[PDB]
């Protein structure tokens, strides 16, 4: 929850949220897997899987 590692994942989740223009399967799967991790880790986050 704490860490530099957590902060890096959230920042990446935020960057992908701001684009929302996924050009491949990787990016959309990454985005959704980050949502899952964020929701599990912090209980509730402001963004949703797409």
């Amino acid at each position: 929850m704490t860490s530099s590692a957590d902060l890096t994942n959230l920042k990446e989740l935020l960057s992908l949220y701001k684009s929302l223009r996924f050009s491949d399967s990787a990016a959309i799967e990454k985005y959704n897997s980050l949502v899952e991790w964020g929701t599990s880790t912090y209980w509730k986050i402001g963004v949703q899987k797409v």
């Binding site: 929850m1 704490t2 860490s3 530099s4 957590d6 902060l7 959230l10 920042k11 989740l13 935020l14 949220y17 964020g38 912090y42 209980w43 509730k44 986050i45 402001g46 963004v47």
Partner: protein
């Protein structure tokens, strides 16, 4: 600013309108426990137990929550040290210094930051003894923290052990980050990036990040 009357010191509790829905239940709970808890000398004094209920909630994005007051010299404002002498607040201030690049300051207070409500899970301890009043506050602590978390986007709790079970104390899910207490071993609080994490989570919820440098006293 409204008030309600209880049967034990402090006898009157003054509260901002945003707290109105919990106040009658607070009165009932406080009346059943206060005599026991008042057998001890406390941090803070009884006349300061509830001073954070004067803060509005509707403008709050983040709750910064410690377990209970300073074992001594609690003011009723969580983490607040008027002459900037307590280790915990100095550590919090050094982290924010490092974050923001503000190097010269004379103090820090979480309670003067826009969008932040500093909170203590338990509202007193017997003087010199952390968590000594957990058993008295329990139902009140849930009542008040649940009310806070209807308003804030992010709950930040300080103390990995103290808050390991915090989710069970809450009804509705809320964004919850548990980081280290400022006195954790091995400089772990120094390495913790909770203030930055809180801001990214706020952006994920389309909220304005906290300006942590507003806490400085010059």
């Amino acid at each position: 600013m409204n008030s309600v009357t209880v049967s034990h010191a402090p006898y009157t509790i003054t509260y901002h309108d945003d707290w109105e829905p919990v106040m009658s239940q607070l009165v009932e709970f406080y009346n059943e426990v206060a005599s026991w808890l008042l057998r001890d000398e406390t941090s803070p004094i009884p006349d300061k137990f509830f001073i954070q209920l004067k803060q509005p909630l509707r403008n709050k994005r983040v709750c910064v929550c410690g377990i209970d007051p300073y074992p001594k010299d609690g003011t009723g404002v969580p983490f607040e040290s008027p002459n900037f002498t307590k280790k915990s607040i100095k550590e919090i201030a050094s982290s924010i210094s490092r974050l923001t690049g503000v190097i010269d300051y004379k103090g820090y207070n979480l309670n003067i930051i826009d969008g932040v409500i500093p909170w203590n899970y338990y509202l007193s301890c017997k003087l010199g003894e952390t968590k000594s009043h957990a058993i008295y506050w329990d139902k009140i602590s849930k009542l008040l923290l649940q009310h806070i978390t209807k308003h804030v986007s992010v709950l930040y709790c300080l103390g990995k052990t103290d808050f390991s079970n915090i989710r069970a104390k809450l009804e509705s899910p809320v964004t919850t980050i548990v980081g280290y207490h400022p006195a954790a071993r091995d400089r772990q609080f120094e390495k913790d990036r909770s203030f930055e994490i809180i801001n990214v989570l706020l952006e994920l919820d389309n909220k304005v990040p906290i300006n942590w440098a507003q806490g400085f006293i010059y």
